[PDB]
Design a binder for these strands. Sequence first.
DNA 1: TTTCGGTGGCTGTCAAGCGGG
DNA 2: CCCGCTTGACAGCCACCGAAA
Length: 167
Amino acid sequence: SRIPLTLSEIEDLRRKGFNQTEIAELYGVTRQAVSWHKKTYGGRLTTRQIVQQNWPWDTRKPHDKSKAFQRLRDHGEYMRVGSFRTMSEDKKKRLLSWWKMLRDNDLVLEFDPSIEPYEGMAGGGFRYVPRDISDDDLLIRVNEHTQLTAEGELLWSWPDDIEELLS
DNA sequence: TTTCGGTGGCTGTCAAGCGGG
DNA sequence: CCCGCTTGACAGCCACCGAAA
């Protein structure tokens, strides 16, 4: 009734801006079938997905509900893209504000899976702590729960032109 | 007004299993 | 076997809503 679902067709429709769930709907399969074809045969990772490969912690649900998780993700996306040209006005505003809060109050983000949710962390697991000289350019505290890759060193460091962006 | 946490539903991946070739 | 799917469970993504400033 149609053509076999190949990786190539999925990639073409993705380049045209359709997401994997919509492609599944087009082909009468589950999102998982589209994902499987992409995961098994090497489909193009999105920028966010690339950032995920270098995510420094094993976080589980509901850490994604903490603003620190979301803001750090946005930061990784920025460092990966290198400008705000691909993100919404909201992502930009929130990220710049978060950066300001971290520098002006001289904080870095720490992750410990044992932190239970608390006011101002609906997801729990994260906490802001004072910066140490040993932290260098990182926005995060490296502890026993941190996996920091070479790329992660760039992703989770300040942008080089950070002073100028906030003005 | 605008800021910013909390929240929900949607999106995507992984593991285990099933059926047909 | 292998390859393409489906379930079920879970991790992550992003704009909207509303209170607070």
